[model samples]
Target: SKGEELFTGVVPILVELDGDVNGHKFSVRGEGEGDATNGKLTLKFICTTGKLPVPWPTLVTTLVLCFARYPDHMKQHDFFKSAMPEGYVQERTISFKDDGYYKTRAEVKFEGDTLVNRIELKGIDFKEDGNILGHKLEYNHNSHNAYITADKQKNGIKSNFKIRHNVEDGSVQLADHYQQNTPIGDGPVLLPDNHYLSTQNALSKDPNEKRDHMVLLEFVTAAGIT
Candidate 1:
């Protein structure tokens, strides 16, 4: 009964970030599905931060601390010094519609010292009559000098970040859009998913100085989740 009730699904999409830099290191990883089932699926993302043993902070702390370090000067650099939360730098999701099927979609923004870095989208687990047909993922990045709107610049600098989606089989596509004049921040935007996430000895004004970063998991989640 339990197994029957469990049901099953597969993921047919994939997202890859290659040669992406994260805090003094280059990371290569991806998120997508390898298979699909009925109505459920699993998506997986894996990244390599090189072998430097960099203290991996939650997407929030990472962004916050980094921004605090050199808020004014860091914006001039061509590359973002820290890695953004996998999904927060943008948004990703899989939704079930009234047509008795589901669709996977994502809206992602990648920014650095340039204009638009990339914008991407994809469809996953699309179905008609209990039979999956196909899916697609597409992305676009700026080619010339570009800039973000004032609103995006302001909120992007200080807001909680998150990435949500499920893995399912279909078609997958990815694109990269580039932009410039993106406002930079110091640390990652902490969110509910980071419950139980903690940090210690975070470098302060002085490299030798340290601080503790703890997550009030329950409170953070309760206040953060909608």
Candidate 2:
């Protein structure tokens, strides 16, 4: 070959080891949202020494079952190809502020009256003499139970967050959270407090300072229009 071969890599990236296939374990990491379609991504390698391996060649890929095996077809399976599609989910940058923790992941799948697949990723940031920070997520489609949680860790201390959606109640609420991991129970709420009605009435009484036409408001609720 050549004499005195020199290779140097000086950069930081957000990468995670996405399972290995064919004895080739590659770290898959990217920005924003991506779907089951065709596209390429930059990958990091498990090099021999040098802290880590050389970044590997760029590759395009699609998942068959990250959470499970069958749902892969539940989404697509025309020619036995995992053709990726396009979807927009903003990628988040890894954050560490006097603390450390990798975010967790969650997903779910369903078959007639059965919970066929599920995943809960709990993250414990690598640390030294400190408690491991944890990130947890649980998702299920067409299933009865689901939950989610995230946290942060530093100096062996931490915070928490949790979310659960039950099919029986069909209620959505945020879970317990604190500090950075504070909860915003359920997603949203609708209360017929009759407060708006009082405002509307008060405005009507003050016709002297009212506009030409009265402003009306209504609350609309729906169940699964999508």
Candidate 3:
């Protein structure tokens, strides 16, 4: 019973917040002013490398951040079984930072979108580089772009991050292969710019600031074969 005794993890957290908060009321935008409520974080993880009967227990839990919009009898079959019912008012010490990042120090009594009380987390740290902004990312395998390039006195500009799905009628189908060779004049296109190669000067050194809040984030991983 040992594949290194199985309890693998790679946790990383760095959150710091206190009192009178309102980062635009933490956002969910219902009637458009922010207040649909959401905040619930719980982390237990207490396993000191088991050899039990020393009260036989080895806990582990994770439900970091629950969401709420409050309606439908406070929900049950659609999720929401007690969230943040006023607990920890103040507590600290979950430290790590010699560049290993695991620092949480909470103090909240907020009430504008949830958390009328509580926020305190204990220690947990592990890292194998998930690139928490240590910048210098560049990839372009024949135009499946991914970039961050602006450091020649801010003139090498290229912040292109294309999470692709081109389909100019070649109607995409992959891993079962059938994507009939497209691209050369489409309804969506990028990569071909001048004025020092712009993704709008790699986004904002304020040439009248309005990159339109450019945001692109992604995550996907799938598995099968049963």
Candidate 4:
């Protein structure tokens, strides 16, 4: 059973979130689990696009693509956008490690003109027991002014776009619809989409467009054996 698999630390978990808010429909997915033995967490998130009823505004699209963070089961203490400084350009490169586990990496790029930028996230790893709370990943702020690396450019110009813990870590909870046996991605749609966090459309000059935005999100848990 899932509870047993999660307890044994042998199972990999998959978290899927799907819903609509402000007329925009989207889906977010995650997989992996916390290993109590070595105290490391490896998880990856994939963001789906065009699911919005009205295509996201260009500024919104760029910001979302470059700096989106998926919502978790619990509400964060502060809004997500508040942590990121608004600027014309910002760059960060992320890397991974191996401990009898999966590995990954990512590079972020920002553009000043029109305040447009491109940043893709892939392969994030954190050293922790996988509690899902206060878990953070650090990246080398390569160059605040540089927009892209040669390799990232080739990948983006060509096509485009793309955590954990263990022990004392497997228990899962749901926000908005707590205490319900509802399947993840199945129900309790988030209204106003204010629970999840991501970058603000700061570059937009319009007063109505500069506000921080959140999206609909929910969670599921799974497990596998070694």
Runs off by more than 4 Å, candidate 1: 1-11, 18-23, 34-43, 52-226
Model 1: per-residue Cα lDDT at residue 203: 19
Q: What is the C-alpha RMSD of each candidate to the true structure, in Å?
A: 22.0, 26.3, 24.2, 23.0
Per-model CA lDDT versus the true structure: 0.23, 0.20, 0.20, 0.24
lDDT of 2 at 216: 16
> 1-226 in candidate 1: lDDT tens per residue?
1111111233233333322211233342333232111111122223344431111221111211111111222232212222232222443232333112111122222232211222233333334332112221111111111122222433332222222112134332212222122223444432212111112222112234133221111101011112
Q: Give candidate 4 regions above 4 Å deviation.
A: 1-6, 36-41, 50-178, 182-226
For residues 127-211, what per-residue lDDT tens digits would candidate 4 score against the true structure? 2332212232121101111111112221121111111112224432111110101111222211122222222121112245222
User: What TM-score would candidate 4 get against the native?
Assistant: 0.23
Clashing pairs in 3: none
Best by TM-score: 4
TM-score of 2: 0.18
TM-score of each: 0.21, 0.18, 0.21, 0.23
Q: How do all the candidates rank in terms of lDDT, highest first?
A: 4, 1, 2, 3
